[PDB]
Design a protein around this ligand. Structure first.
Ligand SMILES: NC(=O)c1c[nH]c2ncnc(NN3C(=O)CC[C@H]3c3cccs3)c12
Length: 167
């Protein structure tokens, strides 16, 4: 039994809510919040910009040090950094950005990173401003992640569409 409230059960291990992941993080303080990152950990907009803003830019400062030491991530890859005031840890996961011309088949690899953590609060990878089909992303999530995932989808119309079309 955990502290997530109001989530709609989709499968054995996947749940969903119409909420801002940032506000969910401030309320639950989960062990792991997932960031929808890019390979440079440049947190300008989307989920990343919103999370980073909520940390008063501390996420970006930490991320710049990480990149200076380790270089960029891979598309489909991840790294674990601090969750700052929002969670114990932040798992920065790079889904492919179709609007940048990145390869859609890498979305499954991106979701595989979730399996290294027992419970996660997460956004819908590669959707929104990342340009991929959100129905496809939810499908890949449910078919790839085996650990317990609490998905927050900010857009109300999209949330309703995702629930109503889910198989
Ligand atoms: N400014 C924002 O994008 C958000 C701020 N809080 C959020 N909490 C949940 N989801 C959000 N965005 N996203 C969707 O609505 C579906 C896809 C997902 C995205 C993932 C990567 C880029 S956008 C946001």
């Amino acid at each position: 039994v955990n502290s997530f409230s109001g989530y709609l059960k989709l499968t054995d291990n996947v749940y969903i809510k119409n909420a801002d992941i940032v506000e969910e993080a401030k309320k639950v303080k989960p062990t792991v919040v997932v960031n929808a990152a890019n390979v440079y950990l440049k947190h300008g907009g989307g989920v990343a910009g919103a999370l980073n803003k909520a940390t008063n830019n501390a996420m970006q400062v930490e991320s710049d040090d990480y990149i200076a030491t380790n270089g960029p991530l891979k598309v489909g890859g991840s790294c674990v950094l601090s969750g700052h005031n929002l969670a114990k840890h932040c798992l920065h996961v790079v889904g492919p950005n179709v609007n940048k011309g990145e390869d859609i088949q890498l979305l499954k690899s991106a979701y595989e990173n979730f399996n290294q953590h027992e419970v996660l609060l997460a956004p819908l990878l590669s959707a929104g401003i990342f340009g991929a089909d959100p129905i496809h992303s939810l499908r890949v999530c449910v078919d790839t992640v085996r650990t317990n995932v609490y998905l927050a989808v900010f857009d109300k119309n999209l949330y309703d569409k995702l629930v109503s079309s889910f198989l």
